[PDB]
Ligand binder design. Structure first.
Ligand SMILES: Nc1ncnc2c1ncn2[C@@H]1O[C@H](COP(=O)(O)OP(=O)(O)O)[C@@H](O)[C@H]1O
Ligand code: BEF
Ligand SMILES: [Mg+2]
Length: 509
RNA sequence: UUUUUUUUUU
């Protein structure tokens, strides 16, 4: 299908809510709702995308805009307008399906729809229901029946669950599907699900298999996403609306980025603790930060350390996929409103989540995918605010920083070295209450995660894997100690005849 | 000795 590039333009006429109203693109009722939010104007992505999404042309839309620049309302606004435009047709049916890669992001988008409802009660008739995992299925279906929503927000697993059973009842008149964080939803592990979703919606559609228009939004996408999306894009033409230059880096330029390089992976823990200590002192505890970590087990561990160091100074919140969904939702609600605190999380929190006035994003180790560097640091410097980011890595992780330059054109100007004092090591290690078996579980989780990104980040396996494994000895304060394991375990992992494996593990069976 | 998420509260 034909990709029509509309690149970033410098001197184009400003689009406003009033101008869209006067032109007849927006109804008074949606104009009202957004106006009462009292935004200075519409963000570039909003100015660029609202009219084309609503256009009577037979096209799909792809939109790139940097983190925190209003992509959500960029699709919610025209969606509401479409509901108003067709308000007498199929009024009890879902007309827009919005898909997101995490439950908390889907629930956030639902909360944004609710903000529109609250700014004009006249829009409550265009109801919305979220379909996400970890919530009561029956209770959600009762809500579908009671409210008969025109907008569904969902995560892929639960949506498929619902579609396999109820696609005929609610989903035969869908006109739009939106993939928020589209590049993530088209990666392995989501792509098959999005193709299943798209296939069901297209099959069940009462007009035709090509009726549904598809909108793709992300801070990170290019021409290659069209290929990946080929099986789910129905229309003969695709409009690519870009608010970023082709050779311009996708990272938000307002973010003051730095990297702190240690000799050992474990030393990044001490570096982060000292950094947070300094920030709490210098900002007089007026400090709101997010710290990312590679695995669930390590995130949980890092949270324990940070509570011991800092719970007296600030709240420490633990956020990952093994936290119950009720608790995930309450901590998201709290961190959105809190002035200060530290959110400790996995990449569950890397994309989309809008926590106002985060001062700093910290990272211990590398993200789960290259693009997530940009999304992680984009949790700060949102909606015109300032922000900083610090990447804490060890020397053997440096090829990641080179790949950011080579692949994504991101050059981190501020780079410095770190070496922990014996004092900070003793302070941090003494409060660790984990048993050796727990430390083994934690470090093994790191070995497995780092192993899966060796090719992507161009790591040297022979250096990175022993370095990660050596974290076990460092945390037990005995550098020559190796991780005790069984031969069957080493066989499973695939390192039983390797010198790399012998440097990491001791076969204490 | 589940590597980030993602139905299985249908
Ligand atoms: N026109 C606007 N002017 C100022 N702030 C806005 C505008 N539209 C949305 N916002 C705010 O910007 C923040 C980030 O929006 P979001 O849609 O999450 O960004 P993105 O999805 O592009 O990362 C939200 O708090 C939202 O209320
Ligand atoms: F690009 Be955003 F932080 F959803
Ligand atoms: Mg977003």
């Amino acid at each position: 299908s034909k990709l029509i590039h509309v690149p970033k333009e410098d001197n184009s006429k400003e689009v406003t809510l009033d101008s869209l109203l006067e032109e007849g693109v927006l109804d008074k009722e949606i104009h009202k709702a957004i106006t009462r939010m009292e935004f200075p104007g519409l963000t570039p992505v909003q100015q660029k995308t609202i009219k084309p999404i609503l256009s009577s042309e037979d096209h799909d839309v792809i939109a790139r805009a940097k983190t925190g620049t209003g992509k959500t309302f960029a699709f919610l606004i025209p969606i509401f307008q479409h509901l108003i435009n067709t308000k007498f047709d199929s009024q009890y049916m879902v007309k827009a399906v919005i898909v997101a890669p995490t439950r908390d992001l889907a629930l956030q988008i639902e909360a944004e729809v609710k903000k529109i409802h609250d700014m004009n009660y006249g829009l409550k008739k265009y109801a919305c229901v979220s379909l996400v995992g970890g919530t009561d299925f029956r209770a959600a279906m009762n809500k579908m029946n009671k409210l008969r929503p025109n907008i569904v927000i969902a995560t892929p697993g639960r949506l498929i669950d619902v579609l396999e059973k109820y696609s005929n009842k609610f989903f035969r008149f869908v006109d739009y599907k939106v993939l928020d964080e589209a590049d993530r939803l088209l990666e392995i592990g989501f792509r098959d699900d999005l193709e299943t979703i798209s296939g069901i919606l297209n099959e069940k559609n009462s007009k035709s298999a090509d009726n549904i228009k598809t909108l793709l939004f992300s801070a990170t996408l290019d021409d290659k996403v069209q290929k990946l999306a080929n099986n789910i894009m129905n229309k003969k033409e695709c409009l690519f609306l870009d608010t970023v230059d082709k050779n311009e880096p996708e990272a938000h330029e307002r973010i003051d980025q730095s990297v702190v390089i240690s000799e050992k992976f474990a030393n990044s823990i001490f570096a982060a603790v000292e950094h947070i200590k300094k920030q709490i002192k210098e900002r007089d505890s007026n400090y709101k930060a997010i710290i990312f970590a590679p695995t669930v087990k390590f995130t949980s561990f890092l949270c324990s350390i940070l509570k011991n160091e800092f719970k007296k100074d600030l709240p420490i919140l633990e956020f990952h996929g093994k936290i119950t969904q009720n608790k995930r939702t309450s901590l998201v609600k709290r961190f959105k409103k809190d002035e200060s605190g530290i959110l400790v999380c996995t990449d569950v929190g890397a994309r989309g989540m809008d926590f106002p006035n985060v001062h700093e994003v910290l990272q211990i180790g590398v993200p789960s995918e290259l693009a997530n560097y940009i999304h992680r640091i984009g949790r700060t410097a949102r909606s015109g605010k300032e922000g900083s980011s610090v990447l804490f890595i060890c020397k053997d992780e440096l090829p990641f920083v080179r790949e950011l330059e080579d692949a994504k054109n991101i050059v981190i100007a501020k780079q410095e070295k770190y070496e922990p004092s014996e004092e900070i090591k003793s302070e941090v290690l003494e409060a660790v209450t984990e048993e050796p078996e727990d430390i083994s579980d934690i470090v093994i989780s790191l070995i497995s995660s780092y192993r899966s990104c060796i090719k992507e980040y161009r790591f040297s396996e022979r250096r990175i894997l022993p370095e990660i494994a050596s974290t076990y000895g460092v945390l037990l304060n005995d550098p020559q100690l190796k991780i005790p394991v069984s031969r069957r375990f080493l066989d499973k992992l695939g390192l039983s005849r390797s010198p790399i494996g012998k440097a990491m593990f001791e076969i204490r069976d």
